[model samples]
Target: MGQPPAEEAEQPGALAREFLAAMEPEPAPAPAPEEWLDILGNGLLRKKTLVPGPPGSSRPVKGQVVTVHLQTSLENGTRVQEEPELVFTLGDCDVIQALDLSVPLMDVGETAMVTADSKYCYGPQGSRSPYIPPHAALCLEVTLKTAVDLEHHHHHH
Candidate 1:
């Protein structure tokens, strides 16, 4: 659904609350922080590590193929699509830019929530689904199941 400009921008209070919450120091064994990461081009792409995976796990590098489960939605929580399993090659995938750029930051078996501006998503035209209107930013949740580095050492658990 297309929301008016005023309505979309009417969340400074929520943003403020989230900002303050993010400032609190996290306790041991606590859940992921509510704050979003500042990845990609500045604030254009952001993410939250939901499931922090194994300690000292290696992240996917370029020229590697990563397998993941993804669910996409609009900023308004409208569902866009979901894939129980998907395999994508780094630096050579046909997926959106934000997704491609975000996956490399995650460790295998980690799940994350990624948010990005329209530019990093489908842009003004949106995508195939009517749930994502034009100019709407997106929320994508993905889990990295496994990854293979073709040009480097191989490790799996």
Candidate 2:
């Protein structure tokens, strides 16, 4: 167990194998994207527009509220919540920072998914009800159903 058998190490293929192993070159690092889209402040968040919505469509504004069917899950296919139609303000929603950032990038009737790093998701302290592990990455599925203009609504006091 400590060392190879003396006779076996002298065999033909044994030394050849040792030579090949020594000549092995280190693997090159993975290639990066040509250009990454800036999603959030300091590029803390990023998303790819999946299942694009219609062109020339209106987006939710700060004062505007939009409806979406939110679906959340863990990295291991654990379901967090399959929420019904939820309405949230563009910049001030109660959801995670990644979801709020993803909203403005979506149009009415658009379905987009964003993979959020731990910082953008539940971060250090995870939630209870669904029990997300610490520093676990999250996958969010958001489907924009409609947007209601809140210009006539009461101002946030």
Candidate 3:
């Protein structure tokens, strides 16, 4: 009987110590929402919408002349170029291929941030005038100002 009571008392003390040790407080905050979408499904290109276009606005198609406000930057946050009104035909390859592919997915008046791997951007032979290093990834912020179908003489708002 004495042994049993002693064992019971020891068990209660051990449990009380464990309960105090388990009362440690945890401090953590909720993580911010990630809005980026992997546009290419290969992690080489990504886009995040900053301002969505109108409900019925039109997206650009191949061969359409699309005007955009463009800003290019390096991965280290160095701004390389800024064009307020850049006009280029879709699929023309005048600009980086990433823009050609991304613009077709965007609606007129939509503002977006894009991340492009070197494969979709300047590739191994990067630009000399803009001073982008070879194989450097890029970040671009663009707003589609207008898209016009020259063949049909139609304009998108």
Candidate 4:
């Protein structure tokens, strides 16, 4: 005569399972000029180049603007995360350590692949969906946009 609602009883279990399932990544194929491949990022993983980076060029200054495309692969060859193209400054952590390291490696019109350690991959508190675990390696294929202006920061203004 004092039984709690069945819905309430099953609520906790359902929620827990959802959270746990979210922790895992999605397995799928990647879009790229090449075929199937595998790449590992800091704690993030994917099948290979799910979010391929663009042909970027130059290391934007603190007030400069740069654009890039990003794709990450799983350590177990899974496709989980990807960014078609992103715009940001070099000094900003908008990207990741791999970009921080590889961006500089490219010329104003050159392109290159960026890969870094988990230590420099995710943020201090880590990331949400497709969470990158600790000590995972990061791989980013970047391309230079060939144009960057470090003059006016209208967005900041």
Top candidate (TM-score)? 3
**Model 3 lDDT vs. the true structure?**
0.77
Per-residue lDDT tens digits for candidate 3, residues 1-157, read 4455534333444444344476677875955344367787777687767777966788888788889897877878887878888888887786778888889878889988887876677767575447567667778888998988864555578
> lDDT tens digits, residues 74-99, model 4?
44545446666666667566567556
Model 2: per-residue Cα lDDT over 1-157, one tens digit each: 7987665344565444343466667776865452345476454465555665766666677656788787777767676867768887777755677777788887777877666665677767465456566567666678877888875655675
Candidate 2: lDDT of 133?
63
Count clashes in each candidate, considering only residues at least 3 apart in sequence or on different chains. Answer: 0, 0, 0, 23
Clashing residue pairs in candidate 3 are none
Residues 22-93 of candidate 1 have per-residue lDDT tens digits of 466657685655448868547768888888686667788866878878788788887688887777777665
**Model 1 misplaced stretches (Cα beyond 4 Å):** 1-35, 128-131, 150-157
What lDDT does candidate 2 reach at residue 86?
Answer: 80
Ranking by lDDT: 3, 1, 2, 4
Leading candidate by lDDT:
3
Residue pairs clashing in model 2 are: none
Superposed by TM-score, candidate 3 places the C-alpha of residue 32 at a distance from the truth, in angstroms, of: 5.5
User: Residue 107 deviation, candidate 1, in Å?
Assistant: 0.8
Model 4: CA > 4 A from native: 1-62, 151-157
What is the lDDT of every predicted structure here? Answer: 0.74, 0.68, 0.77, 0.52
How close to the true structure is residue 103 of candidate 3, measured as C-alpha lDDT? Answer: 90
Candidate 1, TM-score vs. the true structure?
Answer: 0.66
* Model 2 CA deviation exceeding 4 Å by range: 1-38, 41-44, 151-157
Stretches of candidate 3 off by over 4 Å are 1-35, 151-157
| TM-scores for candidates 1 onward, in order | 0.66, 0.64, 0.70, 0.50
